[PDB]
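DOMAIN: structural biology
WANTED: fold as tokens
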Amino acid sequence: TDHQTVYVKPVPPTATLEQLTEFFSKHGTVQAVWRRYFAGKKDAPPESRTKPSVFVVFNSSEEAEAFQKAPPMYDDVQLTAEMKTTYLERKAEEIAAKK
């Protein structure tokens, strides 16, 4: 089983779903996009990660790697995409300091 997920900065209140999708198709091919945030409703510590960041999954392998490396860069709105490796290292170091 293979799973791929990219992390990209959130969108403004003006950017609608229709606008986001349209612009996307205009440049770059993405499979699907989604975002969630765990508020926490238990007596346990924060195990999951809840951030405003959005998750995007590319369908094309080539386009997937291309986007993963660097952002799309759009004059209209500045896009900021991160790599899975970077995030993994971030959390890894974080927990390291705690424990």
In short: The chain has three helices and four strands.
